[PDB]
Amino acid sequence: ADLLANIDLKKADGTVKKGSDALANKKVVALYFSAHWCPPCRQFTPILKEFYEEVDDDQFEIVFVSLDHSEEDLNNYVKESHGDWYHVPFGSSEIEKLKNKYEVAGIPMLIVIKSDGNVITKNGRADVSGKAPPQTLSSWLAAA
Numbered sequence: 438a439d440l441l442a443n444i445d446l447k448k449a450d451g452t453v454k455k456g457s458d459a460l461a462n463k464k465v466v467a468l469y470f471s472a473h474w475c476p477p478c479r480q481f482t483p484i485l486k487e488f489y490e491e492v493d494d495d496q497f498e499i500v501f502v503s504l505d506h507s508e509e510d511l512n513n514y515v516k517e518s519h520g521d522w523y524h525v526p527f528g529s530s531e532i533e534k535l536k537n538k539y540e541v542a543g544i545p546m547l548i549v550i551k552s553d554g555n556v557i558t559k560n561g562r563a564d565v566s567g568k569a570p571p572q573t574l575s576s577w578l579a580a581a
Contacts, residue, residue, distance in 0.1 A: 440466075440554035444531050446500060446523040449515055459523050463552055464496040467561055468535065469522075470546040472504035473514040477570075478545040484566045485547070486520040498522060502535050504544055543571060 441456030460466060469485065471478040489499060499522035505511040508527035515524060525531050535541070539548050539556075547561025563569035 438554075439552045440550065441500065441531075445526055445529065447526050448523060449519070449521060453526070460498055460500075460552065462496065463498045465498075465557065466550050466552060467497070467499045468502055468539065468548045468550060469499055469561075470502045470504060470536065470539075470541045470544050470548070471514075472506075472544060473510050474506070475504075475544050479518065481545045481547075481562060481566055482514075482518040486518070488565050489520045489522065500525065502532055502541075503527065504532075504536075 439457065439460065441460060444456045445453050446456050446459045447453045471482065473479065485499070489497075499520070501515065501519060501522065501524035503511045503514070503524060505514060505527070511524070511527045525535070538554075539546075539559075541548070545562055546559070547565060548559050549557040549561045549564070551557060558564065560569065560572065563572065
């Protein structure tokens with residue numbers, strides 16, 4: 438089973454294919470939940486692009502799941518800052534489905550999954566950047 442087998446996924450060049458074709462041979466997929474309106478998001482995205490380009494690994498893929506408020510904002514964000522990975526089209530019902538499935542509210546969030554959808558780690562952001570302020574403050578509070 439692979440999570441996104443039947444979902445339309447798009448690249449910056451505008452081409453669309455089904456997840457069964459886009460993510461074939463991917464062993465690890467990172468779901469990146471983000472939006473242009475979010476200042477921590479905009480700071481993390483270049484660090485994510487650097488990671489993606491350094492590893493240069495055809496077993497790995499990123500899928501952007503946008504919390505942007507319009508298709509214009511989604512597309513400009515991708516063009517301005519993202520590496521050459523896939524994203525879910527604006528307006529797709531899959532955006533909400535994925536947010537619900539992974540319990541995403543606050544962003545940025547980088548959820549690293551097996552191709553079947555099981556979570557490897559919800560802490561993709563910290564693994565990539567070395568930092569994740571909400572989770573850090575939460576463990577401080579939980580010790581206080």
